[PDB]
């Protein structure tokens, strides 16, 4: 095991904790892109659920200078998530004719940003007119907040719809379920990384779901971090696990709506945990489910299942699915 990945997460967080204070240890998550540059002095934070871009620095020397730098690079960054290291300070951000953010944010001119010229003017504007300052209690932080367009979610999702269509046809899993999961888990952030090393758009863990999927396809080993950070691959894997959950691990459930509630919960909690909500023996755990209505099942799962994380998850995913379901 290269748990030596845990180690440099530990090293990463401690390097930040040293420089920013334990009060300011902001680190990438499933719905939050956070990239440190300039030796942990400058950080760029995209918050994908709230539609905000926050670019901070704590450097006491020419803060505007390299706020400007992060601002231009972040706006123009070409999404290759598999080549970006959010647990590192090395600048592995690349400028692209087609920035990942293109269309999700407009300058104060109202124009989408794709050229270094326009990006530059916009940085200069923000620096002159929206420069903010804060202090942790012990040292001064300079920042710029950039609001993303109101329909930024839809813009982002548009990138992956084709993949979702394909995966859905392939594995017989509803588009709306894939989209509802993906939205809930990452808000369609391809750089998404969790505290349990779930990876990518559909937040797939390598040694559990990833391993199962490979095995179920005559394939050997476990998907790498590069693989699960490639949109197409990740969505195909996640969707495959959705199908594996639905046919194999939870096929005992007869009612498709009840199976779905079970499948959704299990995607986050494991089918094991889900079955052991009805009882320790998979057999009549399944038929206790076969006695209840789906409203029951959704009830019993949203209230009486161990992981609080899961109980909210099922509520969340079903709530999103209802909006992606109608066409």
Ligand X SMILES: CO[C@@H]1O[C@H](CO)[C@@H](O[C@@H]2O[C@H](CO)[C@@H](O[C@@H]3O[C@H](CO)[C@@H](O[C@@H]4O[C@H](CO)[C@@H](O)[C@H](O)[C@H]4NC(C)=O)[C@H](O[C@H](C)C(=O)O)[C@H]3NC(C)=O)[C@H](O)[C@H]2NC(C)=O)[C@H](O[C@H](C)C(=O)O)[C@H]1NC(C)=O
Which residue in the set 60, 251, 256, 272 belongs to the binding site for ligand X (CB under 6 A)?
272
Closer residue to ligand X (CB): 128 or 195: 195
Q: Determine the residue with CB nearest ligand X.
A: 270
Q: Looking only at residues 11 through 40 of this chain, which bind ligand X when binding is defined by CB under 6 A?
A: 30
Tell me: does residue 196 bind ligand X (CB under 6 A). yes
57 binds ligand X (CB under 6 A): no
Interatomic CA distance for residues 177 and 241, integer angstroms: 12
C-alpha to C-alpha distance for 176 and 320, rounded to whole angstroms: 8
Work out which of 15, 168, 234, 268 binds ligand X, going by CB under 6 A.
268
Q: Hey, which residues between 72 and 131 contact ligand X (CB under 6 A)?
A: none
Site size with ligand X, rule: CB under 6 A: 21
Residue 42 belongs to what H/E stretch? strand 42-47
Query: How far apart are the C-alpha atoms of 276 and 279, rounded to whole Å?
Result: 5
Instruction: Tell me how far, at minimum, the Cβ of 302 lies from ligand X, in Å.
Output: 17
Sheet holding 42-47, edge to edge: 32-37, 42-47, 52-57, 140-147, 132-135
User: Which of 97, 128, 195, 327 contacts ligand X by CB under 6 A?
Assistant: 195
**DSSP H/E element including 316:** helix 308-325
The number of CA neighbours under 13 Å toward the Cβ of 80 is 8
Q: Please identify which residue in 59, 76, 205, 262 interacts with ligand X, judged by CB under 6 A.
A: 205
Which residues does 63 contact at the CB level (< 8 Å), separation at least 6? Answer: 57, 142
Which of 36, 87, 267, 278 forms a contact with ligand X (CB under 6 A)?
Answer: 267
Q: Is 320 in the site for ligand X (CB under 6 A)?
A: no
Using the rule CB under 6 A, is 2 a contact of ligand X?
Answer: no
> Is residue 185 part of the contact set for ligand X (CB under 6 A)?
yes
- Among 96, 145, 208, 216, the residue binding ligand X under the rule CB under 6 A is 208
Residue with Cβ nearer ligand X (241 or 278)? 241
Based on CB atoms, which residue is closest to ligand X, 208 or 284? Answer: 208
**Residue carrying the six token digits 């559990």:** 208
Written as one string, the DSSP assignment of 283-306 is HHHHHHHTTS-HHHHHHHHHHS-S
SS3 per residue for 112-138: ECCCHHHHHHHHHHHHHHCCEEEECCC
Residues in contact with ligand X by CB under 6 A are 30, 185, 194-196, 198, 203-205, 208-209, 211-212, 241, 267-273
């Amino acid at each position: 095991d290269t748990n030596g990945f845990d180690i440099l997460m530990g090293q990463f967080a401690h390097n930040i904790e040293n420089i920013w204070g334990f009060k300011e240890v902001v680190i990438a998550g499933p719905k939050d892109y956070v990239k440190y540059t300039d030796q942990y002095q400058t950080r760029s934070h995209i918050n994908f659920d709230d539609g905000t871009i926050t670019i901070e620095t704590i450097a006491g020397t020419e803060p505007a200078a390299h706020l400007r730098r992060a601002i231009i690079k972040t706006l123009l960054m070409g999404d290759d998530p598999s080549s970006v290291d959010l647990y590192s300070d090395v600048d592995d951000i690349t400028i692209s004719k087609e920035p990942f953010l293109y269309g999700q944010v407009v300058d104060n001119t109202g124009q989408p940003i794709r050229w270094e010229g326009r990006a530059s003017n916009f940085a200069d504007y923000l620096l002159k007119n929206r420069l903010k300052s804060r202090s942790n209690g012990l040292r001064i932080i300079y920042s710029v907040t950039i609001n993303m367009v109101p329909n930024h979610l839809d813009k982002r999702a548009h990138k992956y719809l084709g993949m979702v269509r394909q995966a859905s046809r392939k594995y017989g899993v509803d588009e709306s379920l894939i989209l509802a999961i993906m939205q809930t888990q990452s808000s369609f952030n391809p750089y998404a990384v969790s505290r349990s090393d779930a990876l990518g758009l559909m937040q797939v863990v390598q040694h559990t779901a990833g391993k199962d999927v490979f095995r179920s396809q005559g394939k050997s080993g476990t998907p790498s971090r590069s693989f699960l950070f490639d949109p197409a691959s990740n969505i195909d894997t996640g969707t495959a696990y959705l199908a594996m959950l639905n046919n194999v691990y939870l096929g005992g459930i007869d009612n498709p709506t009840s199976r779905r509630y079970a499948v959704i919960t299990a995607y986050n909690g494991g089918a094991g945990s889900v079955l052991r909500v009805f009882s320790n023996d998979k057999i009549q755990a399944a038929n206790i489910i076969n006695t209840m209505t789906p409203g029951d099942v959704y009830q019993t799962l949203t209230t009486r299942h161990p992981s609080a994380e899961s109980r909210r998850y099922l509520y969340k995913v079903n709530t999103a699915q209802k909006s992606y379901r109608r066409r």
